Design a protein around this ligand. Structure first.
Ligand SMILES: CCCCCCCCCCCCCCCCCC(=O)OC[C@H](COP(=O)([O-])OCC(O)COP(=O)([O-])OC[C@@H](COC(=O)CCCCCCCCCCCCCCCCC)OC(=O)CCCCCCCCCCCCCCCCC)OC(=O)CCCCCCCCCCCCCCCCC
Ligand SMILES: CCCCCCCCCCCCCCCCCC(=O)OC[C@H](COP(=O)([O-])OCC[N+](C)(C)C)OC(=O)CCCCCCCCCCCCCCCCC
Ligand SMILES: CCCCCCCCCCCCCCCCCC(=O)OC[C@H](COP(=O)(O)OCCN)OC(=O)CCCCCCCCCCCCCCCCC
Ligand SMILES: CCCCCCCCCCCCCCCCCC(=O)OC[C@H](COP(=O)(O)OCCN)OC(=O)CCCCCCCCCCCCCCCCC
Ligand SMILES: CCCCCCCCCCCCCCCCCC(=O)OC[C@H](COP(=O)(O)OCCN)OC(=O)CCCCCCCCCCCCCCCCC
Ligand SMILES: CCCCCCCCCCCCCCCCCC(=O)OC[C@H](COP(=O)(O)OCCN)OC(=O)CCCCCCCCCCCCCCCCC
Ligand SMILES: CCCCCCCCCCCCO[C@@H]1O[C@H](CO)[C@@H](O[C@H]2O[C@H](CO)[C@@H](O)[C@H](O)[C@H]2O)[C@H](O)[C@H]1O
Ligand SMILES: CCCCCCCCCCCCO[C@@H]1O[C@H](CO)[C@@H](O[C@H]2O[C@H](CO)[C@@H](O)[C@H](O)[C@H]2O)[C@H](O)[C@H]1O
Ligand SMILES: CCCCCCCCCCCCO[C@@H]1O[C@H](CO)[C@@H](O[C@H]2O[C@H](CO)[C@@H](O)[C@H](O)[C@H]2O)[C@H](O)[C@H]1O
Ligand SMILES: CCCCCCCCCCCCO[C@@H]1O[C@H](CO)[C@@H](O[C@H]2O[C@H](CO)[C@@H](O)[C@H](O)[C@H]2O)[C@H](O)[C@H]1O
Ligand SMILES: Nc1nc2c(ncn2[C@@H]2O[C@H](COP(=O)(O)OP(=O)(O)OP(=O)(O)O)[C@@H](O)[C@H]2O)c(=O)[nH]1
Ligand SMILES: [Mg+2]
Lengths: 51, 111, 459, 63, 347, 98, 320, 48
């Protein structure tokens, strides 16, 4: 609607911001399942421990 | 000698066309387009879209090559530094590292 | 933090692309939504901080300051939209843009992992703040207040820049997580004395420390209401937050370097509290009250104990809401009588009964009635300074007496007694004004039910 | 986020920052040595190029 | 001036500078300065009035004296090394003479007196060339001879210029004189870092040129040469006042604006060399410049000064001046800080 | 002296609109402004936000620490071990100077 | 090609278009002297463009849709008020005179631009050269202050020096008793309040300062009320002029290129009419000027640069 | 016909518009081809 299309700007900014925060995590996986505290074996269907 | 991007720079990966720095350069080009409309008292958002497009494209085009030189100059800096360290091992000895159990640090109470 | 930076940025296209008559409605609604999402930063752990990326992290210190910052933006829009009604549309949008850009800098400032990044954003907040005061302040003296504000900050912050760059050369990093592990003790020397002063003076000027506080009463008397709210609520806390971080790398030199600044604060709070008893301008009185409350925070930060750090954090949050309330209460009188003189309009409880209740509640938090978080923060500081030296209780106790006297004096003078005969335009409190007052006090009093979330990392 | 993700994400941040800090300290040391000794590619101030010299027999022999 | 002649004279100004920048022989460097000085005098004189004649004459005497001193340094250098290659000089007396000659050409304190007077006496477009393009040739020579420059001399010239430039601008109401004293102060930053990292000299020079060009262009768009005239802009081109405000805050070195970058990087390079007192003194002294930049913002953008009735007649006509590159220059003048690492292209 | 407009008279919003909420002169905008503030401010942020805070999952691990302390006190007292030792770190892992 | 150096380089030189008929003619005289009718006849017979005397709304006629704007957008200058209350405390007398000089300066720039761009001459009724006679008359009747005259001379000093004087000055010489007779006959209620002393001061300035001055540099032709009816004789006098004085003989393509660059840029033309001299009569407070400027931007076709106003039917804005 | 005088920008300058859009289009093709040739040269030199 031409009346209420401005109301998606900030909610879409949050979704885009949320998405980019998750993308940031994919660049910081050098130690995923490699810390002495949390390192373990993968479950049969598990590919990664977190994403 | 007097070369913007010497041939050895082609061994480096090119900057991605979605580089966040390149996007910012494009945004600066967009802002210049609006300020052009404003100083000449045109409708800021709609006026001359052909002109607004070239502002973005020009900024991105020049920005892409400036980013390429930027990355190459930092690759050269690292290349020079690592070669010099290899050439002069006596000046960069591998440090003998002790654990905190062996190292003595004074305690400064907060009382 | 991108989930907060981007929607904050999107507030600017929203304001500029809104219908002419919907700029306040739209900007207020969506900045309240941003404030709602900021409660996700409460995912805090007992050992580790919330480390988002290479640029931004959040911990128990920055999280409460972040939530206060994002809550204040809609409150500032509510407070400003009335005195800006005559302003033309484009300048209204420019005002809102300055508020939005201030929030963007603030949320980045409080989450910046690297100290030089913190510096740039810490400095960036000056620009919009100065513009708000000088452009939209009401009186001739806003220009002088702008200059004093600008140059007091830069006189201290430029030496901080040199010190920070020097630390990075020596240590190799300014990342705060790195400094937690690579910190080395600061030995006695004249070079280290001036490194300590460069690392601290900028934050002292912002708090402000007694003796470097004269810019703050000026700034408040000249700022518009939104300027006063953000100045008192958040911008003062940039100094406290900065001090809480940088003191990590100044040990053990802080043991003796803090003495002159503890004396200035301990004696400063009694002087500024006493000064409040004689102030004739209501905004100036609230401004001097801030200096006294923040003198407690400086002492707490400088003596570096778990109890003092918990008290400092609670005080910063509690004072932020209380002082912002008091400015909003004083402004609502100004919008009727157009004077800041405290003795001009008296006996307002007879004419504005519900507004007098907000006045009572704000005053009670200002004097730290238990169990408000204002009292929790003050008490934790008093407990920790007693161990530092038992004699401090005398100074702390005297300030508590004086604080009650000037808080109730302000309540008595303006709300009680006889109304002024010739002031016949005291129109009933608007829904906007009542909602603005309650949006301060209600979160403030609700925090008493779960104080741990405003007690900081040492909790 | 679960504590494990934040914990190991923190380690990845620390590794990057620690590596950058070491490189910053090494660069300051390398620059200090190259400037004092002149044996590196940095601080290489030009000297006259020897390809400008004419080596042919001259009008007179003693040169 | 005939438009074709004006073009050829502008190209000769540029050619003289280019000759200085591409030359390996000291004589060609001297020729580049001579050709450049010959071609710039006609654009100082173009408006034909006693003030423009005085400025052109004061400029000629200063630059001619500096070029004679430069040729002395070159000839002394030839006597003691037998060569003309543009590089380090081979005699300390020659180095002092060339350093002093180049300081005179740049208008550095205490050889600064001509800059405010010459800039005041010439048109805005000519002042734009004087305070930007003309800095290129002398700075490019300093870039190449800095190993042999006396450290105490160059740092003394830098410190004096930052003080004189800062103090001199406080007393000014003429915009051309404000820009002149602002130029003097900025030259001091450029030469203070030159002994440590010439790259940072280039960064400061480029950014200074960009912000200086922006300000001169905005003054030219409105034909404003005085503070009070500039104070009428709000009642004619409100957008221009905002651009002026942003650019002045950038020239003040305020974060997050582009003008913070050169001061930021110069302080870094000096601290890496254990220079702490000097950068701190420079940064605090630069607050003098911020003061009289802020004064201009008060009278231009942050307050509305009194207007005149005849101003209403101006509301009916649009800006017809070229304002070439202004939208690009203003964005670079203010919004470049996030791209600071790009300075490595200048390495 | 000069040609300047006179100071306007301050307008009481209640004259034109006795139902004014004090947000806007336009009654329709005024009511909407009141509604977003009251709904997003009180109904959402303060009510749901207070509820969200009330149910934060063991904020900063205080509850886990108490459970862990109970487990250690139980095991240590069963085995006749000190409840807590003065030494945070094992002395055999420390090499003192001199 | 919009005029500029590129157009000049490519052969758009003034001497090409200008003939012996490319003359700037100005008609002067006292009030009700019949100069308006004579000016039209001269222009018709010689095929020149006629400019009606620039009044309070001259600038409106050259911009927008050409229609006059409300009075607040001219500062509330009123010639009617000047006759009713020439000594009004609101400074209307000099505010009008300062505004009228700027209007004449704008018209002179338009006339020169027409002459230099087309080669066709123009006929003006009074000009920036004769505007001072009204100011001197005003001062001598005590209608304006000495500081107003000092302000007027400052603005004139830095503006008139840029332009060339008329080729021909035509003066119609009607004595004051006759002028007053023609004023009462015309029957304009406000004009009849004019004093013969004010009219005598206008004539004294004309004959004391104007005509002697212009004689040094122009061709000055003088006619009586009777001699001015014979337009053909006036035109016969004009066509037989020698044109042996003045700076128009020194002009050349180079100098006329600079002149055309000036007169075509109207903001550059009016630059010094707003010098920051804070005279009470012409100074406008910030709040008023701000309020009036916002109103002006709301006028039809005035928010944006001409050609970019969708509210008055401009199209293809997204490609312009 | 609202304006008393014809505006200098009454109608678009179609030659300028064609040059403007043509320049934008050309710059993107050159940039895209430059990027592709850079990606291939990078892969060849590194054996990928
Ligand atoms: C990475 C660091 C940060 C980023 C760095 C970026 C550095 C800047 C990049 C260059 C930006 C230049 C401005 C972009 C063009 C925008 C203006 C435009 O669209 O003009 C279209 C131009 C005419 O537009 P216009 O209606 O006259 O409006 C002019 C603007 O007001 C504007 O007119 P103007 O007076 O301001 O002059 C602009 C232009 C001169 O005006 C032009 O003719 C456009 C030429 C722009 C060329 C861009 C080349 C970029 C690629 C480099 C290789 O100047 C140049 O020639 C560029 C040098 O149409 C063309 O003819 C296209 C050019 C054909 C060749
Ligand atoms: C007696 C009532 C019962 C009760 O105690 O309630 C249960 C709880 C307290 O009891 P509780 O801690 O035992 O929790 C009850 C739930 N269980 C049993 C699962 C633990 O109440 C609260 O916790 C409410 C906390 C409100 C704090 C948030 C206020 C709103 C914040 C809005 C943000 C904007 C304001 C600015 C904030 C500044 C920065 C923080
Ligand atoms: C991903 C999205 C992020 C967006 C936020 C980005 C912010 C950073 C970029 C800021 C840099 C400046 C942007 C360029 C300015 C263009 C706007 C402008 O200059 O004119 C204002 C214009 C006024 O409207 P108008 O009625 O058309 O009048 C035009 C006057 N000639 O305004 C308009 O009505 C046009 C509508 C858009 C106006 C936006 C104004 C932004 C103001 C920025 C303030 C400075 C930054 C703080
Ligand atoms: C106004 C005009 C006056 C301008 C200021 C005058 C200069 C004051 C300088 C104070 C001394 C700082 C110093 O020079 O220390 C140098 C020294 C560097 O030596 P280094 O080898 O790196 O380490 C071993 C230490 N010898 O050791 C150091 O580098 C440590 C110093 C760290 C950086 C210091 C930052 C500036 C300190 C001065 C300001 C402090 C007071 C701030 C007050 C502001 C109040 C608003
Ligand atoms: C990067 C910075 C680029 C700066 C570009 C600035 C372009 C000039 C300013 C545009 C404003 C419109 C204009 O035409 O400029 C004025 C001036 C021409 O003078 P003007 O009075 O208008 O008439 C000339 C006829 N006698 O124009 C000129 O005469 C040109 C003077 C500016 C040239 C020096 C620019 C700085 C050095 C650039 C090198 C960057 C490294
Ligand atoms: C992104 C990373 C980099 C970060 C660095 C920060 C960059 C920020 C600076 C960007 C460069 C400046 C661009 C600012 C664009 C300004 C355009 C604008 O907001 O509108 C100006 C406004 C329009 O007025 P007008 O032309 O008449 O059109 C409306 C008709 N009424 O004109 C007015 O109404 C005048 C109003 C009075 C002036 C008030 C000034 C306070 C607002 C300052 C905004 C600009 C910020 C300056 C500091 C930077
Ligand atoms: C997750 C995002 C949440 C964002 C929340 C944002 C809240 C925004 C509140 C908007 C207030 C409503 O805004 C207003 O509503 C009405 C009905 O829809 C619209 O339409 C109105 O037009 C005219 C009134 O002139 C009438 O026909 C009638 O009153 C109504 O239909 C208005 O044009 C619009 O301005
Ligand atoms: C390729 C690079 C260029 C990219 C350009 C991408 C965006 C292009 C947008 C074109 C349409 C802009 O729209 C133009 O500006 C605004 C917002 O719509 C409108 O005018 C506006 O006035 C006020 C706000 O000032 C509001 O009522 C509302 O926002 C709107 O009506 C204009 O009437 C419209 O003509
Ligand atoms: C210790 C760290 C912080 C130190 C900061 C000190 C730097 C200077 C801050 C203020 C700068 C203001 O700059 C200038 O100061 C003077 C007074 O000081 C002001 O002037 C004001 O006080 C003077 C002196 O009583 C009066 O004559 C004047 O009428 C009044 O306006 C100027 O209007 C202001 O332009
Ligand atoms: C501002 C004055 C302008 C007028 C200039 C007048 C001309 C100046 C002529 C300078 C030429 C002489 O220059 C000077 O010659 C002597 C002769 O060996 C040099 O040598 C002298 O100093 C060096 C020091 O290591 C040694 O050679 C030796 O101790 C001594 O002889 C100087 O290093 C050189 O600086
Ligand atoms: N104060 C003032 N009035 C002016 C000026 N120019 C014209 N006027 C007035 O404008 C009115 C018309 O001027 P005239 O052209 O001389 O009278 P006219 O009868 O209509 O024209 P003619 O028949 O040619 O004489 C007169 O009342 C003039 O006084 C001026 O520069 N200053
Ligand atoms: Mg007439």
């Amino acid at each position: 609607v031409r009346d209420h299309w401005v109301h998606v700007l900030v909610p879409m900014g949050f979704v885009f911001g949320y998405y980019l925060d998750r993308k940031n995590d994919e660049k910081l996986t050098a130690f995923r399942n490699k810390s002495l505290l949390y390192k373990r074996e993968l479950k049969p269907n598990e590919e990664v421990t977190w994403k | 000698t007097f070369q913007f991007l010497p041939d050895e720079a082609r061994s480096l990966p090119p900057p991605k066309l979605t580089d966040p720095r390149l996007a910012f350069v494009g945004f600066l080009g967009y802002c210049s387009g609006l300020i052009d409309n404003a100083i000449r008292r045109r409708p800021v958002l709609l006026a001359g879209l052909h002109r607004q497009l070239l502002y973005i494209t020009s900024f991105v085009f020049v920005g892409y090559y400036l980013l390429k030189r930027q990355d190459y100059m930092y690759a050269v800096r690292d290349h020079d530094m690592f070669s010099y360290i290899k050439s002069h091992p006596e000046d960069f000895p591998e440090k003998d590292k002790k654990t905190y159990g062996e190292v003595f640090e004074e305690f400064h109470p907060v009382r | 933090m991108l989930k907060y930076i981007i929607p904050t940025i999107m507030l600017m296209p929203l304001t500029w692309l809104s219908k002419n008559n919907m700029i306040w409605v739209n900007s207020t609604a969506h900045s309240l939504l941003i404030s709602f999402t900021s409660l996700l930063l409460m995912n805090q752990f007992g050992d580790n901080s919330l480390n988002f990326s290479l640029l931004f992290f959040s911990d128990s210190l920055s999280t409460p300051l972040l939530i206060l910052t994002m809550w204040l933006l809609p409150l500032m829009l509510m407070a400003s939209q009335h005195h800006l009604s005559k302003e033309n549309l484009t300048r209204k949008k420019l005002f809102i843009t300055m508020l939005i850009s201030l929030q963007l800098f603030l949320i980045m400032t409080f989450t910046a992992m690297e100290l030089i990044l913190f510096y740039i954003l810490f400095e960036a907040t000056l620009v919009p703040t100065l513009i708000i005061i000088t452009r939209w302040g009401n009186q001739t003296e806003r220009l002088n207040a702008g200059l004093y504000f600008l140059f007091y900050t830069l006189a201290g912050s430029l030496p901080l820049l040199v010190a920070l760059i020097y630390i990075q050369n020596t240590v190799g990093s300014l990342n705060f997580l790195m400094l937690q592990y690579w910190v080395q003790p600061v030995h006695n020397s004249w070079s280290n004395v001036f490194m300590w002063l460069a690392c601290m003076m900028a934050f002292m000027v912002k708090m402000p420390l007694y003796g470097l506080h004269l810019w703050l009463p000026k700034a408040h008397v000249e700022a518009p209401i939104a300027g006063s709210m953000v100045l008192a609520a958040v911008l003062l806390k940039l100094g406290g937050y900065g001090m809480l971080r940088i003191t990590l790398i100044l040990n053990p030199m802080t043991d003796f370097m803090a003495y002159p600044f503890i004396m200035l604060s301990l004696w400063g709070m009694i002087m500024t509290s006493s000064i409040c008893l004689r102030q004739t301008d209501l905004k100036s009185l609230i401004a001097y009250s801030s200096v006294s409350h923040m003198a407690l925070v400086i002492v707490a930060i400088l003596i570096q104990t778990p109890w003092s750090y918990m008290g400092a954090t609670a005080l910063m949050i509690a004072h932020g809401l209380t002082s912002s309330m008091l400015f909003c209460l004083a402004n609502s009188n100004y919008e009727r009588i157009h004077s800041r003189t405290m003795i001009l309009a008296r006996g307002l409880q007879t004419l504005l009964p519900l507004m007098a209740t907000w006045w009572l509640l704000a005053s009670l938090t200002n004097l730290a009635l238990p169990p408000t978080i204002n009292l929790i923060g003050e008490l934790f500081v008093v407990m920790s300074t007693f161990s530092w030296s038992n004699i401090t209780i005398i100074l702390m106790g005297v300030n508590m007496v004086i604080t009650a006297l000037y808080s109730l004096y302000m309540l008595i003078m303006t709300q009680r007694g006889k109304y002024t005969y010739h002031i016949n335009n005291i129109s009933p409190s608007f829904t906007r004004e009542n909602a603005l007052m309650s949006l301060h006090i209600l979160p403030l009093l609700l925090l008493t039910l779960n104080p741990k979330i405003i007690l900081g990392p040492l909790y | 986020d679960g504590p494990e993700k934040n914990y190991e994400r923190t380690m990845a941040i620390l590794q990057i920052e620690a590596e950058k800090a070491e490189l910053r300290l090494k660069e300051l040391e390398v620059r200090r040595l190259m400037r004092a000794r002149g044996d590196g590619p940095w601080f290489h101030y030009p000297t006259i190029d020897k390809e400008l010299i004419d080596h042919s027999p001259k009008a007179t022999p003693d040169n | 001036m005939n438009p074709i002649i004006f073009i050829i004279i502008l190209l000769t100004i540029m050619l003289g500078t280019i000759i200085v920048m591409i030359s390996s022989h000291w004589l060609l460097v001297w020729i580049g300065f001579e050709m450049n000085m010959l071609a710039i005098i006609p654009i100082m004189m173009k408006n034909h009035n006693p003030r423009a004649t005085e400025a052109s004459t004061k400029y000629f005497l200063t630059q001619s004296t500096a070029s004679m001193l430069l040729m002395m340094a070159v000839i002394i250098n030839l006597m003691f090394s037998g060569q003309w290659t543009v590089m380090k000089l081979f005699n300390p007396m020659a180095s002092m003479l060339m350093t002093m000659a180049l300081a005179m050409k740049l208008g550095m304190a205490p050889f600064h007196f001509w800059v405010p007077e010459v800039t005041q006496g010439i048109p805005l477009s000519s002042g734009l060339i004087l305070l930007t393009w003309q800095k290129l040739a002398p700075m490019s020579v300093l870039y190449q001879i800095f190993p042999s420059i006396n450290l105490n001399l160059i740092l003394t010239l830098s410190v004096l210029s930052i003080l004189i430039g800062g103090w001199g601008g406080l007393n000014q109401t003429q915009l051309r004189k404000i820009m002149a004293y602002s130029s003097i102060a900025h030259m001091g930053w450029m030469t203070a870092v030159l002994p440590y990292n010439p790259t940072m000299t280039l960064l400061n020079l480029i950014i200074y040129i960009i912000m200086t060009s922006t300000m001169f262009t905005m003054f030219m768009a409105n034909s404003t040469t005085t503070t009070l005239s500039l104070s009428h802009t709000w009642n004619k081109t409100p957008i221009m006042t905002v651009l002026i405000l942003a650019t002045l805050l950038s020239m003040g070195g305020l974060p997050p604006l582009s003008g913070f970058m050169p001061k930021w990087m110069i302080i870094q390079e000096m601290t890496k060399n254990n220079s702490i007192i000097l950068p701190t003194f420079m940064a605090i002294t630069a607050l003098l410049n911020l003061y009289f930049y802020m004064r201009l913002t008060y009278s231009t953008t942050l307050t509305m000064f009194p207007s005149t009735n005849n101003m209403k007649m101006k509301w009916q006509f649009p800006l017809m001046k070229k304002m070439t590159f202004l939208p690009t220059m203003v964005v670079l003048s203010t919004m470049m800080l996030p791209l600071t690492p790009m300075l490595s292209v200048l390495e | 002296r000069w040609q300047e407009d006179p100071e306007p008279e301050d307008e009481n919003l209640y004259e034109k609109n006795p139902d004014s909420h004090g947000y806007d002169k336009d009654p329709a905008v005024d009511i909407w402004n009141m509604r977003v503030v009251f709904f997003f401010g009180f109904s959402i942020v303060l009510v749901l936000g207070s509820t969200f805070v009330a149910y934060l999952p063991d904020y900063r691990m205080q509850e886990w620490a108490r459970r862990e302390a109970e487990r250690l006190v139980k095991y240590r007292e069963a085995h006749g071990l000190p409840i807590m030792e003065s030494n945070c770190f094992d002395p055999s892992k420390i090499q003192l100077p001199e | 090609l919009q005029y500029g150096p590129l157009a000049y380089i490519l052969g758009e030189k003034a001497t090409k278009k200008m003939t012996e008929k490319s003359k700037l003619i100005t008609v002067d005289g006292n009030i009700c002297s019949g100069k308006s009718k004579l000016a039209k006849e001269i222009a018709e017979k010689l095929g020149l463009k006629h400019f009606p005397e620039a009044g309070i709304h001259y600038v409106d006629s050259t911009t927008g849709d050409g229609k006059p704007l409300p009075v607040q957008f001219s500062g509330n200058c009123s010639l009617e008020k000047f006759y009713d209350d020439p000594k009004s405390n609101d400074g209307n007398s000099y505010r009008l005179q300062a505004w009228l000089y700027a209007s004449r300066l704008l018209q002179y720039a338009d006339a020169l631009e027409h002459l230099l761009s087309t080669g066709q001459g123009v006929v003006l009724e009074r000009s920036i050269y004769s505007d001072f006679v009204f100011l001197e008359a005003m001062y001598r009747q005590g209608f304006i202050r000495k500081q107003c005259v000092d302000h007027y001379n400052q603005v004139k000093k830095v503006t008139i020096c840029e332009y060339l004087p008329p080729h021909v000055v035509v003066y119609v010489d009607v004595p004051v008793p006759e002028v007053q007779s023609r004023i009462q006959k015309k029957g304009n209620p406000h004009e009849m309040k004019i004093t013969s002393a004010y009219l005598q001061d206008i004539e004294n300035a004309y004959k004391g300062t104007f005509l002697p001055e212009m004689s040094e540099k122009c061709e000055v032709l003088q006619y009586s009320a009777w001699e001015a009816q014979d337009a053909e004789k006036v035109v016969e006098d004009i066509e037989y002029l020698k044109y042996d004085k003045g700076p128009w003989l020194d002009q050349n393509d180079r100098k006329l290129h600079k002149l055309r660059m000036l007169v075509q840029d109207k903001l550059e033309v009016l630059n010094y009419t707003s010098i920051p001299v804070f005279l009470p009569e012409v100074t406008v407070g910030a709040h008023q000027s701000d309020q009036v400027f916002q109103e002006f931007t709301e006028l039809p076709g005035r928010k944006y640069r001409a050609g970019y106003n969708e509210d008055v039917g401009d199209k293809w804005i997204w490609l312009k | 016909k609202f304006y008393i005088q014809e505006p200098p920008h009454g109608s678009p300058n179609w030659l300028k518009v064609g040059l403007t859009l043509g320049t934008s289009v050309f710059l993107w093709i050159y940039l895209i081809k430059q990027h592709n040739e850079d990606v291939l040269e990078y892969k060849r030199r590194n054996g990928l």
